[PDB]
């Protein structure tokens, strides 16, 4: 009762059972989103409607429970914040999308309201602790890349300006505008058909075109290599920092073990 019911309900919501229970509900809902098919029985559609209604109310009480326990902190964990947004979107996608599309009719919404499906797939990241771990690890790498990504973007902009001015007059489908050139240089960076598809046709007209694209490949490959090396040595720095301190801690343990006796070894002379 009261705060004792809160103490009871917390020991449920934070339980390993409740964590696992919600994971299986997501998997079952994800499976039901695979069995749907435009070519299906009307009664199958009705049954799938009731089943999907059961899921949306069942995840709704989950959100309410999690809000009731975590309260002010719920709307600050990005994972809980994402799950809340997905529940809201999935309510709209089943009880107001008709009321939307019947007035703001647009052939985009038949494609945009898919987002209510995609969001419920992504809950399979948010609920699984091992998946939150890997995703937060991946996200934490991004800040260290920003300076080399900014450098690569500036090099791309410089080369896109030059490639538009050099080749865009006669190969506009590849370089005729800055946006054409950005796309074609990205293809070349991926090495996709870079010679047979782009540069050999260019050298029919621009014999020294190899002097542009081969140095370009070296630059972007070298920056990509150092981008990957940076991620390696950053992760290794996080490791080595621990190995280092653990050795120091044991050196300072040995400092304690010995010097606290070198203290005694002089008062032991007072006798």
């Amino acid at each position: 009762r009261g705060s004792h019911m809160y103490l009871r309900i917390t020991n449920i919501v934070e339980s390993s059972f409740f964590t696992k229970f919600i994971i299986y509900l997501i998997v079952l809902n994800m499976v039901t989103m695979m069995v749907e098919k435009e070519g299906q029985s009307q009664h199958m559609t009705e049954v799938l409607y009731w089943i999907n209604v059961v899921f949306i109310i069942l995840f709704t009480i989950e959100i309410i429970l999690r809000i009731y326990v975590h309260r002010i902190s719920f709307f600050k964990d990005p994972w809980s914040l994402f799950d809340f947004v997905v529940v809201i979107i999935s309510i709209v996608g089943m009880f107001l999308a008709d009321l939307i599309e019947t007035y703001f009719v647009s052939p985009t919404l038949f494609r945009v309201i898919r987002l209510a499906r995609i969001g419920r797939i992504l809950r399979l990241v948010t609920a699984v602790p091992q998946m939150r771990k890997i995703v937060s690890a991946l996200i934490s790498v991004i800040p260290g890349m920003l300076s080399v990504i900014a450098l690569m973007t500036l090099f791309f902009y410089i080369f896109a300006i030059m490639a538009t001015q050099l080749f865009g007059e006669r190969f506009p489908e590849w370089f005729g505008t800055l946006g054409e050139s950005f796309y074609t240089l990205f293809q070349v960076m991926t090495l996709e058909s870079w010679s047979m598809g782009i540069v050999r046709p260019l050298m029919e007209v621009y014999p020294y075109a190899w002097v542009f694209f081969i140095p370009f490949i070296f630059v972007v490959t070298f920056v990509m290599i150092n981008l990957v090396v940076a991620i390696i040595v950053d992760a290794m720095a996080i490791l080595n920092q621990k190995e280092e301190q653990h050795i120091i801690d044991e050196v300072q343990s040995h400092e304690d073990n010995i010097n606290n006796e070198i203290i005694k070894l002089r008062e032991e002379i007072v006798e």
Partner: antibody
Framework: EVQLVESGGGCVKPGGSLKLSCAAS????????MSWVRQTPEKRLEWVAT????????YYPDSVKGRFTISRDNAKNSLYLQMSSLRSEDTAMYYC???????????????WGQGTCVTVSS | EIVLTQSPALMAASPGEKVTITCSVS???????LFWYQQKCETSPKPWIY???KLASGVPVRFSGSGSGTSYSLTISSMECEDAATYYC?????????FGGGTKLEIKR
């Protein structure tokens, strides 16, 4: 063989409108830019339109800007010239021509069709 | 945008004469960008020289082309009756093709 055959043409009234068609064979039509070239009765050659190999870029002289529109269908392997507000100036043989180099929207015209006549006359 | 002028407008060359026709350009252009066509009577033009000097496939090696900048020429080392035709120079720049007026070779049979 690489072959081009133009079609349409014939008589029109001044101010009239006409669509020329060119059928391509013996080469990958979608790899090449294509041009239309006039030959006027005094045998002066005059280029009138160019289209890129994907059709996304088109080029014209100011003699025909807004009056003409070059277009292509890379599946039909066909090239078109819509003409409008036709004038006695536009009385010419019109040749469909392939560019010498792939994707190049410039350079030279390595194969020319047989042509179709246009006679803008009252 | 760039005008090409050809001289002479008509030429009357003996069989076996060396023939030279000139194309003059109102601005300096790359020799890679000047081309020649041969048009026979009431047929479409055919490419004849690619750039200033590379003969097109099947052009008799008695033909040659030479020039740079604002002045270009096509030469026949020894004219034959099959050479009697109108020859057009052409350039490309900006996004326009322009053609010369043509030179009609009469062969004085």
């Amino acid at each position: 063989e690489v072959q081009l055959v133009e079609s349409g043409g014939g008589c029109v009234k001044p101010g009239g409108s006409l669509k020329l068609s060119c059928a391509a064979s013996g080469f990958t039509f979608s790899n090449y830019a294509m041009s239309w070239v006039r030959q006027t009765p005094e045998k002066r050659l005059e280029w009138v339109a160019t289209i890129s190999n994907g059709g996304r870029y088109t080029y014209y002289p100011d003699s025909v800007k807004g009056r003409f529109t070059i277009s292509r269908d890379n599946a039909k392997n066909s090239l078109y010239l819509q003409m409008s507000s036709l004038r006695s100036e536009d009385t010419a043989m019109y040749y469909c021509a392939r560019h010498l180099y792939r994707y190049d929207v410039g350079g030279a015209l390595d194969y020319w069709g047989q042509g179709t006549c246009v006679t803008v006359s009252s | 945008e760039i005008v090409l002028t050809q001289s002479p407008a008509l030429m009357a060359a003996s069989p076996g004469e060396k023939v030279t026709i000139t194309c003059s350009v109102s601005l300096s252009i790359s020799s890679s960008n000047l081309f020649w066509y041969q048009q026979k009577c009431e047929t479409s033009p055919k490419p004849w020289i690619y750039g200033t000097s590379k003969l097109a496939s099947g052009v008799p090696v008695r033909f040659s082309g030479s020039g740079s900048g604002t002045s270009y020429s096509l030469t026949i080392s020894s004219m034959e009756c099959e050479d009697a035709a109108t020859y057009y120079c052409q350039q490309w720049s900006s996004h326009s093709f322009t053609f010369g007026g043509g030179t009609k070779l009469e062969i004085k049979r």
